[PDB]
């Protein structure tokens, strides 16, 4: 019975019932884990066994974080999260650090347990129920539900936000420079000190916390070769928007003209100062493609002119925190991926290109997921909200392995799309 604190009420969005999502297959290696970490949570009684009588459900799976080599249970509370919401956006929204993006070194702390110490609203508990697969379906599933604020549920941080703001009041007053943001199960701490100092300061916060019972994971650092642990910190500076460009041909076959006509045409939607007529003229009659058309000075006049318009920020762009976020990803080629984050069609807030993780094993699924997580992390720092993903992949395939390479406490909202190479504008070069 963890805390004397009085339970805060929550009621899912009107005319909407709780989650009734099925449990996807889990691989031994995960069940085993998912069991042990559920058996023990049951004893400390943060969780409680339950049977059929509870009509709701949500799925669970676990990921062995490479970050700490310690398995972490993960409940896909996206439906439930959606259902319940006057809560975390309107009622107890947690403000955003204008300047978290502005730091040069930010780290994420998994402050999940901090939650296992607050009683979950009495009535609202039927909703967080989940189940556990058994290999070869040897026995029925093992259902349970939460009694304390749950992990990865938009409500926790909102509810805990009170005690969290207290636990950090000191650290922040004694260290006014550091900036701290909380998004669900994580703590975003960013500084402007040398990396060596940051590491320290972060390692020191991991203390001030511990003095409060909030224990955070033990990220390991190996002394053999790939010093992966060197990338733990985020640096919102190599964060550079990637505008579009129009290649350069010494001479331009017919082909070359058209392609560049379309791109220039598409882009017109983004930036409205793109003209094509005085440039497309050079293509007037049904001619062979392979023909080396020469660039009029009337034409070239704008070819290089239009490009000048592609080297800058967009037209009266703004970010409305009241709308959802969307992100698009196009498998560009040989490990390369590019994306755009927008709320309104053709009025993006960002573009860029996740290059690649050298250990991408030449796996587009793996790389893709990683791009997602990556892109997701950015959105959180920058605007403080997760974007809905338009995933360049076939549902059924993505659903088969996204977990395997997933290494995050949260899960973003996604959908699938088969939309071929529209123009090459979403630029490859």
């Amino acid at each position, epitope marked *: 019975p963890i805390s004397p604190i009085e339970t805060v009420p929550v009621k899912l969005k009107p005319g909407m019932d709780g989650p009734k999502v099925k449990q996807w297959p889990l691989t031994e290696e995960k069940i085993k884990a998912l069991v042990e970490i559920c058996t023990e949570m049951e004893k400390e009684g943060k969780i409680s066994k339950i049977g059929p009588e509870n009509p709701y459900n949500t799925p669970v799976f676990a990921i062995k974080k490479k970050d700490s080599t310690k398995w972490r249970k993960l409940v896909d509370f996206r439906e439930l999260n959606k259902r319940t919401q006057d809560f975390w956006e309107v009622q107890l929204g947690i403000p955003h650090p204008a300047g978290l993006k502005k730091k040069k070194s930010v780290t994420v702390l998994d402050v999940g347990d901090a939650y296992f110490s607050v009683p979950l609203d009495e009535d609202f508990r039927k909703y967080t129920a989940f189940t556990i697969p058994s290999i070869n379906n040897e026995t029925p599933g093992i259902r349970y539900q939460y009694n304390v604020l749950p992990q990865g549920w938009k409500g926790s941080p909102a509810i805990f936000q009170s005690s969290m703001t207290k636990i950090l009041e000191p650290f922040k007053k004694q260290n006014p420079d550091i900036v701290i943001y909380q998004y669900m199960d994580d703590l975003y701490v960013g500084s402007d000190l040398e990396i060596g100092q940051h590491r320290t300061k972060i390692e020191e916060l991991r203390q001030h916390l511990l003095r409060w019972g909030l224990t955070t994971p033990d990220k390991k*650092h190996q*002394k053999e070769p790939p010093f992966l642990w060197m990338g733990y910190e985020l640096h919102p500076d190599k964060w550079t928007v990637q505008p579009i460009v129009l290649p350069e041909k010494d001479s331009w076959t017919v082909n070359d003209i058209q392609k560049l006509v379309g791109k220039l045409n598409w882009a017109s939607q983004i930036y409205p100062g793109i003209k094509v007529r005085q440039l497309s003229k050079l293509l007037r009659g049904t001619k062979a493609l392979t023909e080396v058309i020469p660039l009029t000075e009337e034409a070239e006049l704008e070819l290089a002119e239009n490009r000048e318009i592609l080297k800058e920020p967009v037209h009266g762009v703004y970010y409305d925190p009241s709308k959802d976020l969307i992100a698009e990803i196009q498998k560009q080629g040989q490990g390369q991926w590019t994306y755009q984050i927008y709320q309104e069609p053709f009025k993006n807030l960002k573009t860029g290109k996740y290059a690649r993780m050298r250990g991408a094993h030449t796996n587009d699924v793996k790389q893709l997921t990683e791009a997602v997580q990556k892109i997701t992390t950015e959105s959180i720092v920058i605007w403080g909200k997760t974007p809905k993903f338009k995933l360049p992949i076939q549902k059924e395939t993505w659903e088969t392995w996204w977990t395997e390479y997933w290494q995050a406490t949260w899960i973003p909202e996604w959908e699938f799309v088969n939309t071929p190479p529209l123009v090459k504008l979403w630029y490859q070069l």
Partner: antibody
Amino acid sequence: QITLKESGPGIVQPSQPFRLTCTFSGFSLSTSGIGVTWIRQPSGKGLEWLATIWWDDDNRYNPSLKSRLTVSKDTSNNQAFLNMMTVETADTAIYYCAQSAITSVTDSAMDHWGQGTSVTVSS
Amino acid sequence: DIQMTQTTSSLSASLGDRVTISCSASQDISSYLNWYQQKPEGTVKLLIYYTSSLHSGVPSRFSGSGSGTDYSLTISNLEPEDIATYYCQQYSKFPWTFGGGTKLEIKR
């Protein structure tokens, strides 16, 4: 401004322990990437690795001598030591202590060295 | 116990010359090789880290190269201070290991 200085007994009696003290300045044994390594070099022969003591204390030993070697520090005084047990004549060599640092995801090197101490085993 | 070898033991060149030394590993140590310069006195300095990168304040006439198991140090054009023993250390898996050094002498 970084510097390291090996301290030692110079000459040790066969099958007795000896203890090298590496006093440095210009970095702490706290700053994340850091660590001290102890290299050995017998008279006229080449460099041999002994051990490296890291800031997290995930010290790693030369397998061929772990049973005798033992590394440690006193981060407050900026010293790092190395104790060798039951030394034999073969242990006679010049000992270096170097400042090893893991800079990035791919770089780890013993950037600065001392001058070494001359430890000789002879009764 | 990843054996590091420098075939050429004692090599002798002359001022002006350009030389290259061999450091062959026992496995694809993935460019996790460092280069050291021990001058006849006895002090050891860092030249190259990560097969090819240059340590601060190290003459440009210094170059590193190698891949997987074969690596090489190339001194552009000799000077009087370059004429001393050379060491390559592999830091891809403890225990760490250095070559056997390559004595760089002066042909007379």
